[PDB]
Amino acid sequence: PFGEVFNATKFPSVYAWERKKISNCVADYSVLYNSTFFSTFKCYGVSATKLNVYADSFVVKGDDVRQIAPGQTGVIADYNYKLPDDFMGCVLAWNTRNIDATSTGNYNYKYRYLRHGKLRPFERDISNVPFSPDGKPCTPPALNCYWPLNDYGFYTTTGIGYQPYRVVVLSFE
Amino acid sequence: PFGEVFNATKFPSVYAWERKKISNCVADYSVLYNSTFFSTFKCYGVSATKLNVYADSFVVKGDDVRQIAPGQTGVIADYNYKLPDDFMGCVLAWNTRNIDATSTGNYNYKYRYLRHGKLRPFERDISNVPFSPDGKPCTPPALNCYWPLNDYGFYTTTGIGYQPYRVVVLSFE
Amino acid sequence: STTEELAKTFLETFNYEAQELSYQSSVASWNYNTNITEENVQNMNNAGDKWSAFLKEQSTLAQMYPLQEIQNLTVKLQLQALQQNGSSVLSEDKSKRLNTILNTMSTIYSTGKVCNPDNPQECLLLEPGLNEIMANSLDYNERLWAWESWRSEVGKQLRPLYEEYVVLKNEMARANHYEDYGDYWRGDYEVNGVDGYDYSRGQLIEDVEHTFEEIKPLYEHLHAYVRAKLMNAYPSYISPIGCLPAHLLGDMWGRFWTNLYSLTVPFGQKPNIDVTDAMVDQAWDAQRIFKEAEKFFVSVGLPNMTQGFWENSMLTDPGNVQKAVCHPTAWDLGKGDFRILMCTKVTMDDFLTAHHEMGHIQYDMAYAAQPFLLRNGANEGFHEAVGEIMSLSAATPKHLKSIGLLSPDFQEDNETEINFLLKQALTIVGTLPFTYMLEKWRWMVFKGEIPKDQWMKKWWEMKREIVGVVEPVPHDETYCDPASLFHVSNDYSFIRYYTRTLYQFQFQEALCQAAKHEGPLHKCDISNSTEAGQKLFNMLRLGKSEPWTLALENVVGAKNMNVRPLLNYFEPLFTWLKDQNKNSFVGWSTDWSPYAD
Amino acid sequence: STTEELAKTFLETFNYEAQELSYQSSVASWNYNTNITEENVQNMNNAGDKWSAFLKEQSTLAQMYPLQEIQNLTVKLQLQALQQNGSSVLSEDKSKRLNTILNTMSTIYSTGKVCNPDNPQECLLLEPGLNEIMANSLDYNERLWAWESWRSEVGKQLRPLYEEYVVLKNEMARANHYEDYGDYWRGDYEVNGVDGYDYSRGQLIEDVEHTFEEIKPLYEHLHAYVRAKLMNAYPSYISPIGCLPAHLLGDMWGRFWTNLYSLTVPFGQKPNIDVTDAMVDQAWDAQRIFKEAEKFFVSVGLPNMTQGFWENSMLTDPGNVQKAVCHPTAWDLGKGDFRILMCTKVTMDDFLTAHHEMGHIQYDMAYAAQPFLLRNGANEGFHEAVGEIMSLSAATPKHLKSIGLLSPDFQEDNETEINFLLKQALTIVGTLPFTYMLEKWRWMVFKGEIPKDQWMKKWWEMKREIVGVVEPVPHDETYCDPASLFHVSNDYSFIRYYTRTLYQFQFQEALCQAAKHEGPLHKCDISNSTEAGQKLFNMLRLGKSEPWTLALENVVGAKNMNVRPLLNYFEPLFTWLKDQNKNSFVGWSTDWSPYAD
Ligand SMILES: CC(=O)N[C@@H]1[C@@H](O)[C@H](O)[C@@H](CO)O[C@@H]1O
Ligand SMILES: CC(=O)N[C@@H]1[C@@H](O)[C@H](O)[C@@H](CO)O[C@@H]1O
Ligand SMILES: CC(=O)N[C@@H]1[C@@H](O)[C@H](O)[C@@H](CO)O[C@@H]1O
Ligand SMILES: CC(=O)N[C@@H]1[C@@H](O)[C@H](O)[C@@H](CO)O[C@@H]1O
Ligand SMILES: CC(=O)N[C@@H]1[C@@H](O)[C@H](O)[C@@H](CO)O[C@@H]1O
Ligand SMILES: CC(=O)N[C@@H]1[C@@H](O)[C@H](O)[C@@H](CO)O[C@H]1O
């Protein structure tokens, strides 16, 4: 039931990425291999078939797509979606300017840019609490209080690295 | 009667230069104008015509030719042949390597290299008397006594400045 | 968390918010310049207002972090940049009024017109009206008329406004702990903390004045030759030991001698370098002009233009029905969106213009990955300097050959080369004493060194002394001649034109050296030389990131502006000059004027 | 009449007579060295006897003039040079015998042949036969053969004669109030009475060695680097710590590593700096070389060669039927008769040599202006340095390009630079230890410090210690390896080649300063520099009329020889050699032997 994932009319914001569990099924993966539809198709495990899985959906910026690999400096890796060090399967990205961007600006896609400490692999931070770099409760418009969640702002006219990319991460156990 | 001076088979040594008197005669002079044969043609008078003379002949080496002119510093002008400071006509000279020089060495041409005082203009010293720098009659092989006439030695292979040059001095009155 | 930790988090929040407002600001501003509708001027203002209001709000907040509590250039530099206080340091009314002045000076120079006394039904603007006259007219009096009119109508109008402008602007700079507004402007060249790479504000004057002495000999000779030439076009109007009448110099001010070429050309017999007609012969469209420019830059190992550039750029004027502003520009909108707006005609000048403009884009692209606040040329003199470089290599007879534009049989005889070089000097050398002089006055006016009652008296004294140029009509303090030039009455520092001009030759020489070029520096072509690109990209990628001194040393290998490469370029012309002037007077009398008396 | 008075007249007389005799001697000497006929060896002897006798007859008469009573320095030096006792200071038998030793040694050397163990009919002379083998073979055994045959045949022959030559030449030395023949030769460099410009005999040893210490690090690396390379050429014949085997160094003795270029070239895919192939390909001839080198000296301001030079010089081998001595020589016969004797081959070394030789001639012309007795190089080393100055400029890729031996498009980078500096090093730097070591042995022998039963032992000890070279087979005292060199067995001081190479770069550093040269010293070509020409000529025309110390100071600003210039010239290569050498031993053990096996 993979088409129910790639081709889902809407995608999650990275910070609130979705995990869809797939078990008791058989897949060819041929539906994937052959396709210039995919800008990034990088596996971190193998390239065969066994007919047996987790599918993680979300949207990031072209330039962010690199952060969805083991290792990687961060911000999207650091605070949003972290892949594990060794352990892995595949990662699929693709350009969605025509769907997820407008000539006016599209700001529905959120990401988190502030947090006390990075995430653990596959951890998920859904909270939206005002932030101060030394703990302590916060009440904006105050100085040094900020909202940890930022809006992406995807426009047709931007460069490729600033265009929205629907990403799907496949995980194997 | 010029082609009897230049064109003379033989020419004398400087110290023993000859003078030919020229009176009652017409010379066109074109015999000298129309010539790239002459390596030196300096006139301290002019370069014109009246159809009207003394010709002095002698052989000197290339670099000695420059002393055959009013003023002039030493040895050929000093002890051999001196032109008067003002008073002048023309001085012609030409390279005679193939006539007065032999690839084996030609020493017939002499010059005076030691004299008890500079010559006045047009003077001529013919003596072969042994020289002493403080009076004193001489007898070789005694020390501080020298025979004052040296040979040139004109080889075919020397530099231009060491090659022999026939020179004829014309004077007008 | 310290002050430095609280600063990074503050800056980060800025960059992200700035990206959006600024992107919106730019796109709106672009759509305007490309689609002049009343709905668009409404939008450009909309987005420009938010983005400006935001900056103010942010700077005021940024001032709540002291920058000498930070041992970290990168962040220290960002925080400092955001600390553009503004005229917000002044009171409510000294800010509204100043902006009033700023706007009125602007609108006067832009709308100012003068009318033919012999035919008052025809009133001419600067562009294209008066400007056309100043470039092409051979009639001394017509020329005199335009010149005087402009300074006599719009000049006198700007006089009072400019006076108050100077007081109001000075207070601001004082309140920001600068000596004067001049000192404020010199600030752009300043560097604090790095050692040897440091540069003070005053060191600029020093380095300008020292470097300018080494220019006089060349200029004096250029001057002397053109004087002789002009004597022929206006016999009896000009003295062979005097200054050059200010209104005979090729344009409204004599900022450039370019249009004097027709009557100063050394070898009038020799034909074109102009490939204008060679380009048409092959039905070349804009697509080819830029693809070529692009091919030029790829040749030195730099990247293709972005797909978005080809998709979103405006390469040709739509004419009427959707009209646009047509001045050639390179746009850096943000979000990796680069584009050029240029009403491409098919001339050689435009082919070359593309190479300048696309230099900018290449620069802008290189420094994209830098922090938002740090994306810009190393100083005000850098962007254009990179621009001119590209124009220089493209125009070499070697390069036009390579492209398949110059006839491969055309050889470089001693005459076509002096011709061209003179054309170069008429613009490049000609403008340097004028530019120095202009700021010299400006700077001194802001220090108080030139009193109100001697503004014009001191201007013309300096135009005579420094520039070799004289007023054809005398001017009392009712005038304000300097402000009759765009940059003055529109509040832009003018020294960038000098410092750049030298930078660009420093760049060239060092880039050509990197590129093993054999002949005179002026025939150079960095095309196909990747190691040049690398030497250039090394500073191109820096942006405003590290001090311009290091940025320069990256490309040239020296920490300062050196005039020596500039001379080198014009060395074969300088010799010709010295000899052409064998029996001409070289220098001028500050005393002779054309109105005399 | 006084004294200084009576002296002049005598000199004048000596002069005019000397010229005549000395010309007849040379023109004799020449006709022999270009036509070895029976009647010519006769004549060459004759005039040369009538000339030496003359000087002897005049030397005695010179002594009759109390020089330390004369106040004109010009005449005193002339008088002083004429006061020379020479070798006639020995007895009757000890003079004919010495002259017989000298002659026999000369003839054993020039007539030596080796014949193949596998061919009693093929025999090879040193030139060309053996020499070709040494310059070109890649065969260990062939080279071993040639090297050893030579020292076994000619070398052993010479041994007895050399021993008796030592004794007789020492006897003459001491009779002329000198420590030994070593000290005698060291005399050339001596200056007495000038203050701050004096130089003592034993001061040269001090200086050569002081200065040689500084050359060690550079030579050491060069060595290391060439050792590695020779290991690839001769797999398994060389220890990575051993001295280089003496039959592998490119010529018969390892005087020059020049022929090791092809197997040591740093970056062999680069366009060759050895323009030999270029020259052959363009079908250059001897005429072209010399006519080309003449053009070089004209370009700096010096005269052409003389009509006589072209008519009379021997620039090629006549072949067989008319046989000559091919040793390149620069002849100054007298009476402005200059020529070069050279059997020019179309190679790069000959191209360079032509310049060197013509360098000598140009020096000789320059000081033709001098009193007969003063017509020479400032010291034995000045002439050789002058030769090499030229050779320095002509070998630059810059200059090869200019003559068209390198493509006009040839582009200089750091790899071509290293290739060039390496090739230069192989010749220039690599001769230094060889030369220094050759002389020291001789010096020590003359001083008595070395006994007959240790002659070869100490040579080979010093070859190992100082030069890092080892005999491929062991050599008992039947051998006399030094005598296998032309200079040893033909009685010529060697240290000149050492001093020469210092002065060389000293001169060049000053000359390129004059030519307003930009970058590093190794990139300087003085061509077209009338300024540089002028400087050189100014010290050229002085001849021997000045102490070399002052003469040198007037060119370069230094009382003594200085190694700094050489070191700067090679720096880029030194730095590169250090890094190239990071994976190998730098230095050597004196204990490894190719025969201890
Ligand atoms: C005999 C001698 O050597 N005299 C020279 C003389 O030839 C020369 O003209 C003069 C120029 O200064 O110097 C000397 O006096
Ligand atoms: C330690 C240092 O000097 N460099 C860092 C730099 O890596 C980083 O980009 C910046 C954060 O904005 O902080 C510091 O400047
Ligand atoms: C003027 C004077 O007394 N000097 C002369 C000098 O000119 C001459 O060339 C030299 C040669 O004997 O002797 C003296 O040095
Ligand atoms: C003046 C000079 O010294 N150079 C000449 C040059 O003029 C001449 O064209 C050439 C041909 O024989 O010979 C010499 O190089
Ligand atoms: C060594 C060198 O660079 N020679 C150049 C030569 O190449 C050039 O063509 C000539 C003409 O101006 O002048 C110079 O002598
Ligand atoms: C704290 C910070 O923002 N610094 C980053 C850091 O993520 C990175 O590891 C380092 C590379 O040296 O420098 C900056 O790009």
Ligand SMILES: [Cl-]
């Ligand atoms: Cl003005």
Ligand SMILES: [Cl-]
């Ligand atoms: Cl040996």
Ligand SMILES: [Zn+2]
């Ligand atoms: Zn521009």
Ligand SMILES: [Zn+2]
């Ligand atoms: Zn030599």
